[PDB]
Write a protein that binds this ligand. Structure first.
Ligand SMILES: *C(=O)c1cc(N)ccc1[C@@H](OC(C)=O)C(=O)OC
Length: 240
């Protein structure tokens, strides 16, 4: 997260760290959202590599023991059938991770609330991006969970030429694009939490920023629109 502020410990308790085994250590790669005590939602992109992955719930500082962590193995990964590694701008940047165990829910560990199917937000809707990603373009990961206020930008503006054009599809949410605040690599997979009827709900799974840089005026961060996937997400869980 470019241009963000440290989050309070308990603000975003559905945030996870997606980590891979890196020699004899574990490194953060992605975010995600805990959606069931045994299921995480992230981006397909985050699991293109055939690596050994773990989930961290209740994470605040990547490098220090918070006294609130739970560390859980990934038992099965289910990527969207239409995801293609070579075409992110096609969309379907969505994955569901089944965990090797159910996590215990407490103040640091809650489920993410998903929108109703089909739900589209109005332009300039109040949303936050969270995550441990890079804090400048070509910079380094954050140690503590960062948040940025990132209002939405509706599809008609986002798909205009001076924005993303045709790169962006109505299966995606765009948010931000001020030049100052963004998602950045390491936030892929994470949540875009948006305030609807006085409750924060996860409308976005972080997908991409510009090759030109993370914080680029009129290049909003692009999310997979969760409301487009609710039938698929339910259909996976009921059967897996
Ligand atoms: C996501 O964590 C990530 C990581 C790496 N190494 C490259 C790209 C990405 C995505 O970044 C974000 C901000 O989502 C990405 O831009 O995918 C196209």
């Amino acid at each position: 997260v470019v241009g963000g502020t440290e989050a309070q410990r308990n603000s975003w308790p559905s945030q996870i760290s997606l980590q891979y085994r890196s020699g004899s250590s574990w490194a953060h790669t992605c975010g995600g959202t805990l959606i069931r005590q045994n299921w995480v939602m992230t981006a397909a992109h985050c699991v293109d590599r055939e690596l050994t992955f773990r989930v961290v719930v209740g994470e605040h500082n990547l490098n220090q023991n918070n006294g609130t962590e739970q560390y859980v193995g990934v038992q099965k990964i289910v990527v969207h059938p239409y995801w293609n590694t070579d075409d992110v701008a096609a969309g379907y940047d969505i994955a569901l991770l089944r965990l090797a165990q159910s996590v215990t829910l407490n103040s640091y560990v809650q489920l993410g609330v998903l929108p109703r199917a089909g739900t589209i937000l109005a332009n300039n809707s109040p949303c936050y991006i969270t995550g441990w990603g890079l804090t400048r373009t070509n910079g380094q990961l954050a140690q503590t969970l960062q948040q940025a206020y990132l209002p939405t930008v509706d599809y008609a503006i986002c798909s205009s030429s001076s924005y993303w054009g045709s790169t962006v599809k109505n299966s995606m949410v765009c948010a931000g694009g001020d030049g100052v605040r963004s998602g950045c690599q390491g936030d892929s997979g994470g949540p875009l939490h948006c305030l609807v009827n006085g409750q924060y709900a996860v409308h976005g799974v972080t997908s991409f920023v510009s090759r030109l840089g993370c914080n680029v005026t009129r290049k909003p961060t692009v999310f997979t629109r969760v409301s487009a996937y609710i039938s698929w997400i339910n259909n996976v869980i009921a059967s897996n």
